[PDB]
Amino acid sequence: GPRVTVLVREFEAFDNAVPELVDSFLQQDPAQPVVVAADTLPYPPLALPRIPNVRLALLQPALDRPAAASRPETYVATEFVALVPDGARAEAPGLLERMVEALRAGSARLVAAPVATANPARCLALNVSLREWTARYGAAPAAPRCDALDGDAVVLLRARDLFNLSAPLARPVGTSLFLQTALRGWAVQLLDLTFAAARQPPLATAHARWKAEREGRARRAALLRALGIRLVSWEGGRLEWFGCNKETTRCFGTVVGDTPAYLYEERWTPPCCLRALRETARYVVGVLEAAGVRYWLEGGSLLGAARHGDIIPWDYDVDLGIYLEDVGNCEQLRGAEAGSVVDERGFVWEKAVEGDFFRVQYSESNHLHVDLWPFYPRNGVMTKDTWDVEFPEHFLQPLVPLPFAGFVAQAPNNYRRFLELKFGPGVIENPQYPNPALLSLTG
Amino acid sequence: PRVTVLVREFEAFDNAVPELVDSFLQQDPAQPVVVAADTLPYPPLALPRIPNVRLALLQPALDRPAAASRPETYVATEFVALVPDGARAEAPGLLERMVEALRAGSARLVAAPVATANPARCLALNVSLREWTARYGAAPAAPRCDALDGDAVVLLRARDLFNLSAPLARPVGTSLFLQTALRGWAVQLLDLTFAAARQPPLATAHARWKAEREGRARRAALLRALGIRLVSWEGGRLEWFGCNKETTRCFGTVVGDTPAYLYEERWTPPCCLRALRETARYVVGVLEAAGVRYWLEGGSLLGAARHGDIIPWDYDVDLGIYLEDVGNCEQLRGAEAGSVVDERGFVWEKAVEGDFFRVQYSESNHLHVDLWPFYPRNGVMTKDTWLDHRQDVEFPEHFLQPLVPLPFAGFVAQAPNNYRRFLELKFGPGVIENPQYPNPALLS
Amino acid sequence: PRVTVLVREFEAFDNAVPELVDSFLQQDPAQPVVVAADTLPYPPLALPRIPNVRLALLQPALDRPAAASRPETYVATEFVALVPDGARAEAPGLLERMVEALRAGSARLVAAPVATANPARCLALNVSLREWTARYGAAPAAPRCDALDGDAVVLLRARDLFNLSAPLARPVGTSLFLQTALRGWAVQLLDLTFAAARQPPLATAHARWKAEREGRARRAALLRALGIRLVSWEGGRLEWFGCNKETTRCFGTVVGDTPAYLYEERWTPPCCLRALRETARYVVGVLEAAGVRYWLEGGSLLGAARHGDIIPWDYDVDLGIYLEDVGNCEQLRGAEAGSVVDERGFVWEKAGDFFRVQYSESNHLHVDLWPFYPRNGVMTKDTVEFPEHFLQPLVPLPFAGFVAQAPNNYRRFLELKFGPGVIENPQYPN
Amino acid sequence: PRVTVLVREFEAFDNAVPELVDSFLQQDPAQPVVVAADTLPYPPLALPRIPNVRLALLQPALDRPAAASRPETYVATEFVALVPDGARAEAPGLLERMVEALRAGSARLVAAPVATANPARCLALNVSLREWTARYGAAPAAPRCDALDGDAVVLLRARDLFNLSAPLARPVGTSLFLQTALRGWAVQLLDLTFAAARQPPLATAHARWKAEREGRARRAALLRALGIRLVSWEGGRLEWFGCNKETTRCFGTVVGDTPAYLYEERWTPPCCLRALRETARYVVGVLEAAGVRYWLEGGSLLGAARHGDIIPWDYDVDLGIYLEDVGNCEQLRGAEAGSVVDERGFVWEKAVEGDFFRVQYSESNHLHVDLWPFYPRNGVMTKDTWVEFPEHFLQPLVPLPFAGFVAQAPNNYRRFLELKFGPGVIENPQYPNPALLSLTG
Ligand SMILES: *[C@@H]1O[C@H](CO)[C@@H](O)[C@H](O)[C@H]1NC(C)=O
Ligand SMILES: *[C@@H]1O[C@H](CO)[C@@H](O)[C@H](O)[C@H]1NC(C)=O
Ligand SMILES: *[C@@H]1O[C@H](CO)[C@@H](O)[C@H](O)[C@H]1NC(C)=O
Ligand SMILES: *[C@@H]1O[C@H](CO)[C@@H](O)[C@H](O)[C@H]1NC(C)=O
Ligand SMILES: *[C@@H]1O[C@H](CO)[C@@H](O)[C@H](O)[C@H]1NC(C)=O
Ligand SMILES: *[C@@H]1O[C@H](CO)[C@@H](O)[C@H](O)[C@H]1NC(C)=O
Ligand SMILES: *[C@@H]1O[C@H](CO)[C@@H](O)[C@H](O)[C@H]1NC(C)=O
């Protein structure tokens, strides 16, 4: 009895070669189990053979079906599942068997065989970091052992592994599967086997490709947002973003009890939010330097600068100190005492509700901000008559350059002494990343 | 008797879940409680972090197994009680009495109203997926109902709830009884009342307002996902959830003369049918006012002869008109120059394929009436271009002299005389008495 | 028919808990499973991280609420099945069959042996808190039993298990039936059989010996915490869990002639009585070797007359001796200079009219020797008296495992000292 | 009546609990009073036989229901006042004063010192479970505190006290504030004083000696059970409660390579780090005096470059050495022939596994410094078992602070570290990830 169930999930209803795919596997073994899975009944009809080992699995809730009907493991009775993309065909007999033999003999929980299309599967490296909401892809250093595949491959793994993931069949499978398996530390072995292409390949015209790719990028975008992947990178670069921006709200919205929503989700600050914070800091610093406002990294920004030259990865704002006596040198600041001011580049400058400090928002919609805390000497010690620690004014005589958030910012001289006076001894050396369990106990 | 309290209906921005859960914990410190949500609620729910109170997140996640989003794996007890936000346990032993009534009764669900401004009421409910409709009315055999409207604790066996396809789809008040009534199950409305929340949620008019809107949006999403286009109540009042003048038609381009919904074992959506009847009514009024001779044709005449309406799986309307009359109608005259949007938003155009005219419900909604021009050759009605149908044939002009009245789509339409013989000539003997799909070589 | 599997008996260093849990999950993927432990097991159990399988850590923690160590809070179902490591579910439906037998029967617990090397056998069990003793034997009414010895799945209602004072105290097979036998509950040893793990734990000789040694340590700590100083078996085997030659005695300094165990509504710990009997026998032996005239006195004579033993709530032994003979005994001559620790560890002291022999330097259970002298034909000390004819002659009287010497006509002698009817009217503590 | 007096800190052999109970009853005969003990106190306390005075025995017993050992079972008021032995109620209207203060302020605990020789002082306290440390200090915001030192009545809500995991674990003065400070709760030390008992307990040197021996034993057992390996005062006066030269290391055999402490969502116990630092310093001392070229390697060099210490979740130290130098060191030459215990108890052995050397802290405590011999071939440092690196990184070695002393590091160690670990590794620590560990294994 067959030990592998072919499963087809990646195809387009308007233009596919799924009937040829199914027919090709049935022509090596008429009893071969084949499952085609879809969110709704594909139209135009697929007209697959009406035989018991071929089944359409409709992954949608329906008023007249049991819970089992929308669960893909219901449709698989074999030990192994072979995910087969549309556009493949089985011509050499026994390829699924060789893949089973390779899986059992190897040490990778997945094995794959490229399909000989215009885009055969390439072996990739992938690091998934849920805390940084990032998926980092790269060339696979230990090919043919990989974390992920790009392109067309028959992928074979045990049904109990596949159907135990949270989103076994979320689309595109080429993205969702390896996000889940790579996070788990599993590997995929690119075998030296090749499945043939369909004789009449799907999506043969430019217009059909255009529709297919438009829908698939839309599925991918929605998939990465639902799964909490805000940034995709290739070799550290070619950033592809899925978070907040100048024209949207910031990811975590309004903060309740100075504990942003992302900490309860056991993650750190989204990288789109950190990116806007860096850009807003660079911009405010550039403006203050050109206007003649003396400023220095303050608080957690200074602490992040001194520790690793960037925003601390679970922080969500930037704090700078300024000489109160110099506020008038800056137009945006001058206007900020009157009322909120939207400058020429969309940055919003406000005088705070209470507490006498200035706030610069990334944009009118995206409320990530830099806070400016004005101080004035009172006989050698900086003070704000509203309350951020009081400190001696010689720490600013003079100020020091310090790498921060991708540029050079000004800091208090001997910032190490400055940091422990405000935070306590040894602060630079002992970071404490968020503690969700502790947070769960203490609200 | 062990019962898990399961909380699904609440709002993250404004709720009384902490009070709800504490009220059951005051009665039994080890009381199992499951709060279910699609995403982690923020601001934090701050439930007691004790092992018998769990939060079930129904979203997929990269670092969780499939079971973590299946709520049955959080319920170990035989029974489960769905409790809405705004409710509280005050009297001891309420859930136990509900268990007793379920074991003693015959209904598969029992329910207790909550003493909010809107306690649950007993309702009747018929679901027809084929017609995309759910029909509510007054309960004939109260306190035994098919569905409830309003706030109630609903107790049923875990095995029964979690074998539904969408046990926790929101609103539960709508979703649950749609699934239970379809299965012939009854909910027995008990004479027990749960108390309301001391600090009820949604205390301000603004908070209430943004809740009713988010609920309506969820309810509409629910009915679209489940294929309910039309909801009716006794009193005759209707809520729609499909087509209108401003949207697309529900089903899209038809291949093989068999629309997508037939493969889904459903008939034409009632909203598409409504648009087709209103377009047929309008077009007939225009042609009559213009002096264009028209007759019901094809499947429209067939439907007319059978039951005075569109065939319930059909998706367009067909009229024959005299060719020499097209010049009488302003929209028709324009349609030969190009597509014409007229005074009521109907779109008239000469079709790609067969030198016939098409009238679309709107620019976005392409439900249409097709007008087929005919001219008499020698007492024989005919045209130059033919579509590849067994229904597209010549026929004797005497069938059009004279035309007879015939109810169709809510109005009186003109039909060929002896339309039975007419229909049998075009479709074959007995067509009126033998309904069949537009092509049974594919689907019958 | 919803049953939570509850695993408590396993060793972190060597266990088959992953197989056990997986076997029940094959029969039902949503089977509730609770694995209970005092601390987080390492190496990791690596249980499935699915909502119906949970690890309950029972010790206190700075960062957890009270509820987190209370096991009932992890069990929502009506029934619980305690499953020992080494067992696996093969046939489906075994727990529901056990539930049915439970509802059908009259035993508050039912049990099914596991086909290990040591499948559960039935036992009788009698618990006497007053005497700090648990007594096991062969069970007359098997398959209905007070306790079990060996591997079994035990099923009971969760309200029954978790109202016990120490439901999951280890070892479970000792602690559970101690608590249920004391309440009059019975266990029915059903005829069902759970299979053994396909890869059993403790496969090597070193592993098994390491497990037996830590188990004996847990068993000993359990019996000490619950007040079982002695486990006795039908056939004579005795297991001691109290004081001995190298420890302190169990109760320490008595105030107001009422030892601590009386206020706990218990009698003398049996290990303390055993030490007293052995000191009495040793002292009598030394006295008889040195030719010292001794007789039973006070409560020891009373207990000898009543039942040939120490009164079970007494805590010392009193002997009278002829003062003229004190010199014939080395230990007692030495006792006048100072404390004497002899060959065998006994501590002889004079303190005070009288001498006192302690079982050992650490264990101060003692025999008091009170010397008398004949002056009037009456026996008298110098800091109550009785006529000398009660000692001429002395009679043999069983006491504490040996033949002691007692005044002649000692019943008459006991009612001179204590009043009439004393032998038949024991002054029971209340 | 809204406050239940709860007495937990006393000694059976010598106490003033009868005077205490009486004093509260003299001011209100109906006062709820609970004396809590693990076992029946002997000699008998002889407390009044009235319904509002109860003796709670918290140990499990064969004849008692579960509830009997749960302290909330004995309390039916909203508040609990923890009262130490030695205190006495004289001024009426004192507990109601503490309730009024509690309600009107923000602290969930309020306290009043008792006028003994050791009246309560206000302290700061941070608890770090990851570092297994309790850091005490003088309270910056007195009389708002994190913890108390000395005798005080402590009043808080019953629901708060009996929700803690170990609400009456002894000593209370230690156990309570470890739990409340971890939760971020404060205690407010009021300007109210409870009088002392007229006949104070433990008045003799001998009675005090016994009580202090017992209390210290209870506290050491309490700290081990709760995972506090290290107590400090103002960062000094260190008190240790973990492993040492004469014991096992805290976590024993690593099977991951994921030590047990990561599964407990903590870092390396600080006693283990202390042993590792001292072994690294001793080994380095031996290598320098014997003339062995060594350098910090792997995560030791990485930790030195990041913050000059062992990475706080790492559990060993790695050093490279020149293989041609091994002969210069007696311990190493002995290690090739068999395991050698040297004059100070360190164990030098040659793991035949990976062809390196390993120095253990002691025969029992297997925290170790690993020594990786390299040899050059064409100016590339290499070895025969396992990355290799160019020798110029060792020509010359540079000083680098590490673990309390100055150690040798490759020159350009940032470039050295980046080649081995990747760019940015110094700036982006791989912080322990409980959630992920729970997923991968
Ligand atoms: C993934 O992580 C490893 C180890 O942290 C690192 O060496 C590698 O360069 C990373 N790969 C990518 C593509 O980010
Ligand atoms: C008990 O403590 C936990 C913190 O782990 C908290 O979640 C819960 O709300 C507390 N309950 C009460 C009644 O304070
Ligand atoms: C529901 O269907 C039943 C069965 O024919 C019918 O008697 C009843 O009138 C229907 N009720 C509603 C509200 O449509
Ligand atoms: C399902 O996934 C979880 C990981 O989150 C794992 O613990 C469990 O063992 C998996 N079950 C199977 C059958 O692989
Ligand atoms: C327990 O009690 C009965 C009498 O009530 C006694 O006959 C039986 O022997 C005792 N059990 C054992 C094991 O001795
Ligand atoms: C003890 O038994 C009673 C009655 O069955 C029940 O109310 C209570 O929950 C039980 N205690 C537990 C299960 O801890
Ligand atoms: C506790 O932490 C705070 C800030 O984290 C620090 O300022 C205070 O100095 C610390 N106190 C002690 C005694 O470590």
Ligand SMILES: [Ba+2]
């Ligand atoms: Ba900050």
Ligand SMILES: [Ba+2]
């Ligand atoms: Ba038609």
Ligand SMILES: [Ba+2]
């Ligand atoms: Ba038509």
Ligand SMILES: [Ba+2]
């Ligand atoms: Ba006596």
Ligand SMILES: [Ba+2]
């Ligand atoms: Ba390392």
Ligand SMILES: [Zn+2]
């Ligand atoms: Zn963002």
Ligand SMILES: [Zn+2]
């Ligand atoms: Zn429609």
Ligand SMILES: [Zn+2]
């Ligand atoms: Zn004893």
Ligand SMILES: [Zn+2]
């Ligand atoms: Zn240690």
